[model samples]
Target: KKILIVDDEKPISDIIKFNMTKEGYEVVTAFNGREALEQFEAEQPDIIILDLMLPEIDGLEVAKTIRKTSSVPILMLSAKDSEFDKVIGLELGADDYVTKPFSNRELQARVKALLRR
Candidate 1:
């Protein structure tokens, strides 16, 4: 399945992209929230790996916008593991979330689970 990875940090984003690709998932990437939306619309990836803090638009806002249209699973990424962040993301329709510094293996595990569900 195809996955869209959205993060402002190039190093982390690249790492996720490379690992997911090696795992045999087709991958697309976006550096910020606006581009994330554009990519989602154009690419129609099966899942989205979205970061919380983003340029142009916030990740939560992106999720909110997407929820209005599609039920595609969104796995939110947040450096701040605050209660409000997770709660709001859930409210906005994120299927799951991983805090920053999560293991790639763990993320992939979640991805596999979400795909199954």
Candidate 2:
């Protein structure tokens, strides 16, 4: 499966990409919301791992935009673990979230589980 990882932090994206790629899935990285949308259209990824804080546009807007045009599964990643943030993302159509500082094992599990669903 192809996964789009949208984050301004290269390290974060690299970590997820490395593990997901190791699992035999295709991975793409977007360092900002603009790039995310571009890659989204080009790759038409099977799933997306989006960051809450991003350059150009925020994760919430990206989620809203994608939900407006497609039903592709989304898993939001954020340092902000507040209830409101989580609610907003879910309300906007994100299927799940991997909070910042999360372990790769748990994140991979979440991504796999979401895809399974």
Candidate 3:
């Protein structure tokens, strides 16, 4: 499986990239929403780990655009703990939501579950 990880936070992105790579998934990293879309078009990743707040287009918009054309699974991440945001993201086609400060094991399990579906 391949995953596109989109986060403006370098540390979070690196941690995910490292762990997911170790799990034997091909990983692509993007630091902002624009880069995310660019890489998405270029790589056509099987799944996406997308942050809610992003530079350029933002995660919700990215999900909205992608939903217009694809059913690729998206697992959203956000430091914001708002239920509204989670609801909106799911409505926009996100497959799952993970709040920031998440456990690595939990994130991995969520990814695995989404891919299974």
Candidate 4:
């Protein structure tokens, strides 16, 4: 499966890219929300790992735009732990969330479960 990981943090994006690629999944990376959306449209990935508080456009805006056109599974990755953030993201159509500082295993499991469903 293909996963598009969008994060402004290079190290975080690198870790996910390496781990997911090692797991035999296709991985693409983007450093900003604009780049993320461009890559998403071009790659048409099976799923997305999105970060909130992004430059240019935040994850919520991306989710809102994407939901209008695609059903691709979106697993939000955010440092924002507020219930308000979670509620807004979920309501905007994210399939799941992996809060920042998340374990690799947790992210992998969430991705797998979302894909399964």
Candidate 5:
């Protein structure tokens, strides 16, 4: 399976990329929402891990845009624990939401669960 990870923070993206790659999944990455969209179009990954706050365009907008044509699973990440933000992400077509500082194991579990669905 292929995974696309989008985050403005290099450390976050790097960790995900490292772990996912270790798990034997093909991984692609993007540093901003615009790049995310472009990569999504080009790669058509099986799943996406998207950071909510991003440059050029926000994660919510990226989710909304992708939902217009694709049903690819999306997992949203945010530093904020606001229910409203979670609601908006889900309503916009995100499959799951993970707050920042999550454990690597938790993220892998979520990814596995989503892929199973």
Candidate 6:
């Protein structure tokens, strides 16, 4: 499976990449929203782990834009765990949501859950 992880924070993106790669999934990464879209088109990932806050474009726009073209599932990451964020994220096309400071296994489970559905 190809998983695209988009986060402006390099450490976070790298951590998710490491964990997803360990799970035997092909992991691709982008540091900001612009790079995210570019990678999205080129990689055609099976699923995406997207951060809410990003440079160049926000996660919401990325979700909406991508959903306009594809049904690839999205798992959103955010430091803020507000219902409003979750609602908007899902409304835009995110299939799941995980808060920052989440465990690797927690994220992996969500990814698996999304893929399962």
Error of 5 at 110 (Å): 0.5
Query: What does candidate 2's lDDT look like per residue over 7-99, in tens digits?
Result: 999888899999999988999999999999999999999999999899899999999999889999999999989999999899999999778
- Candidate 6 ranges with C-alpha deviation above 4 Å: none
**Residues 1-117, candidate 5, lDDT per residue (tens digit)?**
999999999998999999999999999999999999999999999999999899999999999999999999999978967989999999999999999988888999999999999
Provide the global lDDT of candidate 1 against the true structure. 0.94
lDDT of each: 0.94, 0.92, 0.94, 0.91, 0.95, 0.93
TM-score of each: 0.98, 0.97, 0.98, 0.97, 0.98, 0.97
Q: What are the clash counts of all predictions, listed in order? A: 0, 0, 0, 0, 0, 0
lDDT of 4 at 92: 95
Q: Give me the runs in candidate 1 sitting further than 4 Å from their true place.
A: none
Q: Candidate 3, residues 1-117: lDDT per residue as tens digits?
A: 999999999999999999899889999999998999999999999999999889999999999998888899999989977889889999999999999889998999999999999
- Candidates ranked, most accurate by lDDT first: 5, 1, 3, 6, 2, 4
- The local lDDT score (0 to 100) that residue 86 gets in candidate 2 is 93
Q: Model 2 segments beyond 4 Å from truth? A: none
Which runs in model 4 stand beyond 4 Å of their true positions?
Answer: none
Which of 1 and 3 is the better model by lDDT?
1
Window of ten residues with lowest summed lDDT in model 5: 77-86
Model 4 residue pairs with clashes: none
Q: Worst ten-residue run, lDDT, model 2? A: 97-106
lDDT of 1 by residue, 5-102 (tens): 99999999999999999999999999999999999999999999999899999999999999999999999987979888888898889999889889
What are the RMSD figures for all models against the true structure? Answer: 0.6, 0.7, 0.6, 0.7, 0.6, 0.7
* Model 6, TM vs. native: 0.97
